[PDB]
């Protein structure tokens, strides 16, 4: 499963 | 040997052509096993390998929802980056991420990934320490500070050392028998005319997997690492790969040259020469 990305 | 779970994620803005296109693709050991594409009729994370089909409905729901959340973050990222680089609101732009883990034979993490690119160039990347960031330019320094101020490296570290590794192990159990596929190259030499007193000998390797391969031409023990033409390894379209390497040789001297094929599926490298038709 992938990561839950933050915003840049 | 080592294994990896990596997600390669893209959003491409399309001002006046609708919402950005968002694509998220998962790889186990460099083999695609899942895909989400926002342009599908109904956007859902889909299996791309048969061994993934055994994951139940809740898995697909949860990961579809995660992708939709990542899609939103990428949409926001693009609007933000437009401002950071002082670009006009009318142009098309791309953001890409490679995220995931590489683990050795012993199950320990070798490398954890979190790399960003804007318009095909490095933006920011997580360092091997899993604590700090390398910013590629001035704009990325804004993100570096933000993520330091949010403790992002710690939340990311927990995923990389924990979640990523644990799930990789599960995927490998389900996919081992399939991921282990090896197809040895079947090789042959072709013969083609050149001007005057020269000919081209082309050594073909076909039907192989993985794509990693080496082809060499030898004249009397010596590797001709200067005048050999070679193509980039290319997919046949059926899961297997193709490559060739060619040399220009004097007419009548075809039997003085040998091709060698090196692959992981070959116990002993192949040796072959031009043989005229039966």
């Amino acid at each position: 499963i992938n990561f839950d990305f933050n915003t840049i | 040997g080592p294994h990896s779970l990596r997600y390669f994620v893209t959003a491409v803005s399309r001002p006046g052509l609708g919402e950005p296109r968002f694509i998220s693709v998962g790889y186990v050991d460099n083999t695609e096993f899942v895909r989400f594409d926002s342009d599908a009729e109904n956007p859902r994370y889909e299996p791309r390998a048969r061994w993934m089909e055994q994951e139940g409905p809740e898995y697909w729901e949860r990961e579809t929802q995660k992708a939709k959340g990542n899609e939103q973050s990428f949409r926001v990222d693009l609007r933000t980056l437009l401002g950071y680089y002082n670009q006009s609101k009318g142009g098309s732009h791309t953001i890409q991420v490679i995220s995931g883990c590489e683990v050795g034979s012993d199950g320990r993490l070798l490398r954890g990934y979190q790399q960003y690119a804007y318009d095909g160039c490095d933006y920011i990347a997580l360092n091997e320490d899993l604590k700090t960031w390398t910013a590629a330019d001035m704009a990325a320094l804004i993100t570096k500070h933000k993520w330091e101020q949010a403790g992002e490296a710690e939340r990311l570290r927990a995923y990389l050392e924990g979640t990523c590794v644990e799930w990789l192990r599960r995927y490998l159990k389900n996919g081992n028998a399939t991921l282990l596929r090896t197809d040895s190259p079947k090789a042959h030499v072709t013969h083609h005319s050149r001007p005057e007193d020269k000919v081209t000998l082309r050594c073909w390797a076909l039907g192989f997997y993985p794509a990693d391969i080496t082809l060499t031409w030898q004249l009397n023990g010596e590797e001709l690492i200067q005048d050999m033409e070679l193509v980039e390894t290319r997919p046949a379209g059926d899961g297997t790969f193709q490559k060739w390497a060619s040399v220009v040789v004097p007419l009548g001297k075809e039997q003085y040259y040998t091709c060698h094929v090196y692959h992981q599926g070959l116990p002993e490298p192949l040796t072959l020469r031009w043989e005229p038709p039966p």
């Binding site: - | 695609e32 895909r35 890409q96 379209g237």
Partner: protein
């Protein structure tokens, strides 16, 4: 910087005149991902050309495989024409049955 596509045109199996085969057009090393690929027979657009889903490599550049069913003959000419923003005009690469 925008990256200019690299193009290979080739058959799935060694070509034999009169035998059904598949013609591939493998396009790599391009950025942005937007790309237009046509396959041409004797200068005329081929209707049914399937495209793989797009993927990218560790250097961020994209790749894709276009393919169509074909039966080679002695005299029929095949090509792949690629239009991409990195190039001032569309690039046409001819199939060489020896490559």
């Amino acid at each position: 910087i925008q990256k200019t596509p690299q193009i290979q045109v080739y058959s799935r199996h060694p070509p034999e005149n009169g035998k059904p085969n598949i013609l591939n057009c493998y396009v790599t090393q391009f950025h942005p991902p937007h790309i237009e690929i046509q396959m041409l027979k004797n200068g005329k657009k081929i209707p049914k050309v399937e495209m793989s889903d797009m993927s990218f490599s560790k250097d961020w550049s994209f790749y894709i495989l276009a393919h169509t069913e074909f039966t080679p003959t002695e005299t029929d000419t095949y090509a792949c024409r690629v239009k991409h923003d990195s190039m001032a005009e569309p690039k046409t690469v001819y199939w060489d049955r020896d490559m």
